[PDB]
Amino acid sequence: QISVRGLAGVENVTELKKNFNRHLHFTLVKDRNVATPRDYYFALAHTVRDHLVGRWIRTQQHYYEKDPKRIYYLSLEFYMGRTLQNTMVNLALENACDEATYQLGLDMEELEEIEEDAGLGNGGLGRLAACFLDSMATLGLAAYGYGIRYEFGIFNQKICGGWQMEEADDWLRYGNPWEKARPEFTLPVHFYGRVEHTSQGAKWVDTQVVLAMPYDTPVPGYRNNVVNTMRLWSAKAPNDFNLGYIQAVLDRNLAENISRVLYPNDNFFEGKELRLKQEYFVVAATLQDIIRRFKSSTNFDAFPDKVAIQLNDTHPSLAIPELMRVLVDLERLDWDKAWEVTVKTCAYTNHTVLPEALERWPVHLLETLLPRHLQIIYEINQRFLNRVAAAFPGDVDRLRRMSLVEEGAVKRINMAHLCIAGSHAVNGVARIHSEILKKTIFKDFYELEPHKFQNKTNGITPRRWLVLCNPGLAEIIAERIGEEYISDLDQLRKLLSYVDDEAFIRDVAKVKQENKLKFAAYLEREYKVHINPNSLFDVQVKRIHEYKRQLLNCLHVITLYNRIKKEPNKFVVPRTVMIGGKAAPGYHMAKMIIKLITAIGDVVNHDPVVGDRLRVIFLENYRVSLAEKVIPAADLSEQISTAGTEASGTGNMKFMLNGALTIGTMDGANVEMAEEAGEENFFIFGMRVEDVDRLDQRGYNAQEYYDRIPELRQIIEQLSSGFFSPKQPDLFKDIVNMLMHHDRFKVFADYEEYVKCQERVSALYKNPREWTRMVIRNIATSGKFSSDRTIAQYAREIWGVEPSRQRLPA
Amino acid sequence: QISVRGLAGVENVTELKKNFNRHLHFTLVKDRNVATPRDYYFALAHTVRDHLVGRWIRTQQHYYEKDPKRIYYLSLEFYMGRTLQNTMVNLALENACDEATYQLGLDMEELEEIEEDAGLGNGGLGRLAACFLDSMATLGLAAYGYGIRYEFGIFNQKICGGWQMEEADDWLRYGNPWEKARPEFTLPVHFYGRVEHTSQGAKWVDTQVVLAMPYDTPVPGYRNNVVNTMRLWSAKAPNDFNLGYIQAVLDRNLAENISRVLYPNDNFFEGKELRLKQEYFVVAATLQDIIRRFKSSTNFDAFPDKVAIQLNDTHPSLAIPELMRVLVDLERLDWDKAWEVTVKTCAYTNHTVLPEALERWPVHLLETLLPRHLQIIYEINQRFLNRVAAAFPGDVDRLRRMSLVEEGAVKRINMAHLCIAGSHAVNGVARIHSEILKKTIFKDFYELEPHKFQNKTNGITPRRWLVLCNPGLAEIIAERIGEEYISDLDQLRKLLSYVDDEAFIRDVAKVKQENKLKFAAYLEREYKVHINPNSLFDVQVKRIHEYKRQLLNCLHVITLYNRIKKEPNKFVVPRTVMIGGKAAPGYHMAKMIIKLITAIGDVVNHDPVVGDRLRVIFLENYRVSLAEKVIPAADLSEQISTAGTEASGTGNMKFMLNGALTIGTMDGANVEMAEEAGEENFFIFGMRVEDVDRLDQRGYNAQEYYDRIPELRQIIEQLSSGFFSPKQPDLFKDIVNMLMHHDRFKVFADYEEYVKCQERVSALYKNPREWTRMVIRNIATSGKFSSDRTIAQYAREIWGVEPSRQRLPA
Numbered sequence A, B: 001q002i003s004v005r006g007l008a009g010v011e012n013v014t015e016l017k018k019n020f021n022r023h024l025h026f027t028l029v030k031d032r033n034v035a036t037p038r039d040y041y042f043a044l045a046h047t048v049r050d051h052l053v054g055r056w057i058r059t060q061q062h063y064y065e066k067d068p069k070r071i072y073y074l075s076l077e078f079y080m081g082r083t084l085q086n087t088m089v090n091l092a093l094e095n096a097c098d099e100a101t102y103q104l105g106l107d108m109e110e111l112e113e114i115e116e117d118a119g120l121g122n123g124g125l126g127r128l129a130a131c132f133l134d135s136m137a138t139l140g141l142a143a144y145g146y147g148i149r150y151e152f153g154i155f156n157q158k159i160c161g162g163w164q165m166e167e168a169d170d171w172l173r174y175g176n177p178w179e180k181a182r183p184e185f186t187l188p189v190h191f192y193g194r195v196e197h198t199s200q201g202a203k204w205v206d207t208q209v210v211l212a213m214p215y216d217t218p219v220p221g222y223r224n225n226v227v228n229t230m231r232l233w234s235a236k237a238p239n240d241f242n243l244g245y246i247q248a249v250l251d252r253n254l255a256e257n258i259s260r261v262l263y264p265n266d267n268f269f270e271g272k273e274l275r276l277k278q279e280y281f282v283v284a285a286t287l288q289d290i291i292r293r294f295k296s297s298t299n300f301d302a303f304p305d306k307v308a309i310q311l312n313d314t315h316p317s318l319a320i321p322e323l324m325r326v327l328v329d330l331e332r333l334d335w336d337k338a339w340e341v342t343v344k345t346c347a348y349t350n351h352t353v354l355p356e357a358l359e360r361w362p363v364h365l366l367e368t369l370l371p372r373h374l375q376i377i378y379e380i381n382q383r384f385l386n387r388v389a390a391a392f393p394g395d396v397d398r399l400r401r402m403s404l405v406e407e408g409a410v411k412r413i414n415m416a417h418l419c420i421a422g423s424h425a426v427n428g429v430a431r432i433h434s435e436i437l438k439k440t441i442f443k444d445f446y447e448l449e450p451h452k453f454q455n456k457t458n459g460i461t462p463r464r465w466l467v468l469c470n471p472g473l474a475e476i477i478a479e480r481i482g483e484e485y486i487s488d489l490d491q492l493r494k495l496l497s498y499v500d501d502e503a504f505i506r507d508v509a510k511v512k513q514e515n516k517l518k519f520a521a522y523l524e525r526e527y528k529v530h531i532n533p534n535s536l537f538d539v540q541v542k543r544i545h546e547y548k549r550q551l552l553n554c555l556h557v558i559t560l561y562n563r564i565k566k567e568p569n570k571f572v573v574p575r576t577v578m579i580g581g582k583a584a585p586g587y588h589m590a591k592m593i594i595k596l597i598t599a600i601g602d603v604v605n606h607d608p609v610v611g612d613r614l615r616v617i618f619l620e621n622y623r624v625s626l627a628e629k630v631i632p633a634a635d636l637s638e639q640i641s642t643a644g645t646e647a648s649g650t651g652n653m654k655f656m657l658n659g660a661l662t663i664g665t666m667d668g669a670n671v672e673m674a675e676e677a678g679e680e681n682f683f684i685f686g687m688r689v690e691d692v693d694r695l696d697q698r699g700y701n702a703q704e705y706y707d708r709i710p711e712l713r714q715i716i717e718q719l720s721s722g723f724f725s726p727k728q729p730d731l732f733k734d735i736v737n738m739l740m741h742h743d744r745f746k747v748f749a750d751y752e753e754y755v756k757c758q759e760r761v762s763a764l765y766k767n768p769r770e771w772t773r774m775v776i777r778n779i780a781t782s783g784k785f786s787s788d789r790t791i792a793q794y795a796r797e798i799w800g801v802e803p804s805r806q807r808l809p810a
């Protein structure tokens, strides 16, 4: 069909068809008379999987022979989403499979919609790990993703009566064809117990044991025949566990609950014991695997030369004291040598500045669960503070500020301080974020060891976020500059010479229109809701959180509605405002925000005077597969977090690559995006970080804005009087109260600027040709945001390895 | 290698080898350099499994086209044991696979030992269901086995310090290649709730729902290309289950615990709620499947003509009221018509007479868990007793004796009475057992409906219990009468004309010697224990229970030991006494019996004066796979239950078919075995049922025997004084107390006869030629005990279907 989807050769199509029938028969044990679409999906999945296996085995054999430095990416989240199409794309099998299934009388797109998303993540942090795995494989790095195989990933969101309802994400129900259980590599993990100081060294004894069973999933690089591994651990009790008889067998669930479910919090720390167990479980099993592989390649001096451990935030921070425990207690190395090895091996990536998101574990928890690790942490703190004391003599406050141990109500361990002390590199995820780290929260550490602090701006993989979800756009681009950009996104800059090309301008706009029509159809298919494909698609999709300010978006929507009602027969650019995202189960304000959105839609979408000029839809169950559908159809990307709160953001990059213009604050990566495309091609508004600080020093008083802005006052009064909740007049009292008295995110402060800049957006949309030309300038300069660039920087500046675009024999 | 194992054709061996390599690569994702024996086992299992799939699909398609009457065998136990060799035997692939693996440089026997036993049963009852499935497939019946897929089967037994230790049987750890999950056929099962009487009929509402997910396993017939299905249900919570968030997800285990573990009791009733849930779970899911299949073949008048439901004991007895519930509450049939259909559809098999083994569920349990079913049961009882009252006017005691509702401390429901009332056929499992049922426990019911009572003597499958476990014997037999006997065991009667054949006599004895050498080697391999292959192998393997009297065996062993010590230089036939079997976790006396056995061995096996003349070994973890090894190596089979307690026994039949002579009481099937072979060819001893009754009427006084038998007195005094437990002198006080004051099984009463008859056994063993000739007479007359004969009788006399030996196109 289309070029970038590969060749549909005669021999391969014939081969695919026969293997498809083979699997349907021998693997699924069915015939064409009783097979359902799901059976067909699995037959295709197994057929494609077969093509991975040869490459997977020789890739790993290759690494064994050449023995390069290995990269271990530890994360408690891997937001992978579907795997079928991604595998076909990276293996250049899309057109062949499309043809083969066509000839079998099946629609491949229909079958792809059957696969369940692998939702082992909450949002940005988890998706970043997924994009990174793709880029590491595409760049030929010997990398391994290590995490937990949650039985239940992020919950499926249902909207009932305008409220969010959560239901278990039983994603393994029908089986997972992509994973390979490896029970032969099961390892033991220890919990509780006591420390016993003998003659030679300490010993951790009387522990409870939980087995870690690994499951391997292949990670194919883009058409380079490289297939890396993502290994996820599953908790299993030992057979002598708790061994009345029946009850002992039933209580095995206690131990296996460790890998049962993903904590659904985005940028929020919940200090629960079960979570601490998950964190140590991944770290303990992973490190034994690392050391095992290392020994099978005695003198750990070369350990840092053959191993790199990247901590995705502080979730796997226990790797630092666990590595020390193993080297000191088990391998018998002296502390100083063990510490040298640990520091040179570990690197830490920070993903936030919000105080409530930082991990601070109560000492009493670590004391009971990991007694030996708490002793090691105290020792580390002792030696670190001695260093601080020697560098800043007499500065006693610095000592208490930098301590890994925080005093107070309950003593806690600051895991971020632990990570900085035990890593040779610490990085932020966007230029502005990394600078904030050095200027504020980690200022003392930067002054002690400036060389440790770096920046590695985030990115997204152009395979899943362009070729896979937007083939039409990838095609018109390839037609004019070739296919090389798919693994070298900087080449999109060549599109700049087509900004005045009438043909290209028309094609770009046509692809967008087709995407909007397709999405507009999808909305009626699976959700039954009519929308106007000619309107401007204004979308904000991301987790629901006060700092992301979906509330500011709501204020604008209500403003537009009030203006229409004020002058009904005045022309306004038609808009379809789409807002989607999940709220953490226990985050009350976030759940109220969702109710507000649907409540607004209930009024706006049924007002005869508005017509098809304004629609407000809440996108249900936003997840990776839904993102792949709505982002390609968007015109406006909403990235409006309060300056200084969104560390980077990645959804912003996805929209830029897919042809949407961006309205946002100078926050996170938005700053670098505007810098790359030129501020005149971005819709920037609001306070900058410096303005927010000025406001805080002075004291934020929402009342001031309410008194000076009539339109804003009207909105607040509508919310307060029950205009959007007739039956429950005070339903939104909490929202109004927060907005008026304790809004940590200054929604009102950016209201005027936001509405004004939204007017400029509507003005440009009225001129199709100029809107598209600006779009072209955005797509053309989005190259820097490829995760291939990000990973190459990690490789060269942190891991000490060189990326390679060399193909392996297939 | 050997004839009965099929042909090793050139084309097939080549084909097997390539498919083996294909699976090792694509399925297991390994290469010959990192593959372990387990990987090879799985590659072979998948290769053999492939050969089943074509036959499995066309068999089921066949039944759909011809639409014969279908047989549903409901059981909460299916003791299947390994599946690899059995599949090869039934598909005539054994020699080809043997050759193919040989050429690949692998020992197939070594790989077979890697497979885990499917131990979803306790003993005889569970194994019977397994043999029955094999015979039903071999006889071409459209039969389905329905049960529960326990995550943990019968526990693995470890012997520590002479005591039994139980450890979880995590048989699914490495995966099960034989099963096929069928999540698409998942059905809902209801629990708790309340009954609501409306205008038209009652309704069961406010129930808790648990999903039943089926897993299908193929059951191949013997070389007839028929492959039936065994469907096992697995418990799964609904995704909206219990839907803080985390806890709700974790509490899903509550619902899924239903299929977690098999209750480890043999002939013992434990009235636990979890067990009741398992029983209803299987019944509810199975009946919906049956009705669904029936409708897809409106007027249930033909239901009994297209459906037969066989209840394996009372465990699935709720099928009777559940069928009524569905027909009356859901289908809206009138009671009388519904009852007529139910009775004609259901048949019940009783497997015991021990009072403690009969199911009597507390009304308060059924009341809370299955409110609608308890109402239906009361109604059934009401109508049944009205029938009794009309047939036996004025007989008020009969009314209370026959009631399904038992009064007393706590009201209970007698499930056996429920089954008789709601079934058109009730059978015992051995002639003597069936007669006892009519004369004692079910006397009142027999007088009311004599036509319902039948007998169906048990049997074993000659495929697993001869060809599979004893190829050497199957071969020498085939050499002289062909292979037709494998599916027509009555032909073994032709061997009678070889009883005087010197060549045959020599071959029979040679096969036994080889089996003993092989087993003697196995004992040193996996368990490290030296034994003399020239001694008489005296074995008693079966579950540990007081009625089976392993204690009587112990008394004989100690007697032999005391006699040797008395006259050290006197000649005695060397013996290796082997006793094995598991004890239910909560059965204290049974666990003490095991300790006694090992304690005896500790003294006997280390006494210099005894030498290699007497050895006492306790066979650890007796299970199906171990049975296949020890039975072919046995010389003496111990079947010494107190007359009237062993309903049938099946281990007795396995020994007879494999060349061992039998020493036993006239109990269960032993009576028919002696009748078939001739009493002169059996070692029968002890009280008959009539003698036991005489003793009970008079009053059993163990003291009498103790006073009149010096050798017995000496033994009891040795046990009491600590002779077998030096460090713990009163360790066996409970055993002595029971034996002397409350032995329900009269161990002492049969002691003298037993020892005397054991002397006759030793006398015959001294004459190899005559011992073997008697063996030949046993093997030659064991034909009646084939489960093919048993199933043909069930088919013709109960289910109303004709068995077929016709091959299906392959």
Ligand SMILES: [N-]=[N+]=NCC(=O)N[C@@H]1O[C@H](CO)[C@@H](O)[C@H](O)[C@H]1O
Pocket (backbone or CB within 6 Å): A124, A125, A128, A266, A267, A268, A313, A351, A352, A357, A429, A458, A646, A647, A648, A649, A650, A668
């Ligand atoms: N742990 N924890 N929570 C922190 C977290 O999710 N951070 C997110 O990281 C992603 C990936 O670095 C950023 O793009 C988001 O801006 C940032 O909020």
Ligand SMILES: [N-]=[N+]=NCC(=O)N[C@@H]1O[C@H](CO)[C@@H](O)[C@H](O)[C@H]1O
Pocket (backbone or CB within 6 Å): B124, B125, B128, B266, B267, B268, B313, B351, B352, B357, B429, B458, B646, B647, B648, B649, B650, B668
């Ligand atoms: N439920 N329950 N327990 C009863 C039971 O296991 N019965 C056994 O059945 C098997 C199979 O009918 C008989 O051979 C045994 O003699 C008998 O004890």
Ligand SMILES: *Cc1c(COP(=O)(O)O)cnc(C)c1O
Pocket (backbone or CB within 6 Å): A122, A123, A124, A127, A541, A542, A543, A622, A623, A624, A627, A648, A649, A650, A651, A652, A654
């Ligand atoms: C890209 C992505 C995110 C991150 O979006 P931001 O706007 O940066 O928070 C979250 N969820 C999903 C499903 C995504 O694909």
Ligand SMILES: *Cc1c(COP(=O)(O)O)cnc(C)c1O
Pocket (backbone or CB within 6 Å): B122, B123, B124, B127, B541, B542, B543, B622, B623, B624, B627, B648, B649, B650, B651, B652, B654
């Ligand atoms: C045949 C068998 C039984 C039944 O033996 P009996 O002596 O009749 O009780 C029990 N367990 C296993 C493993 C068997 O193979």
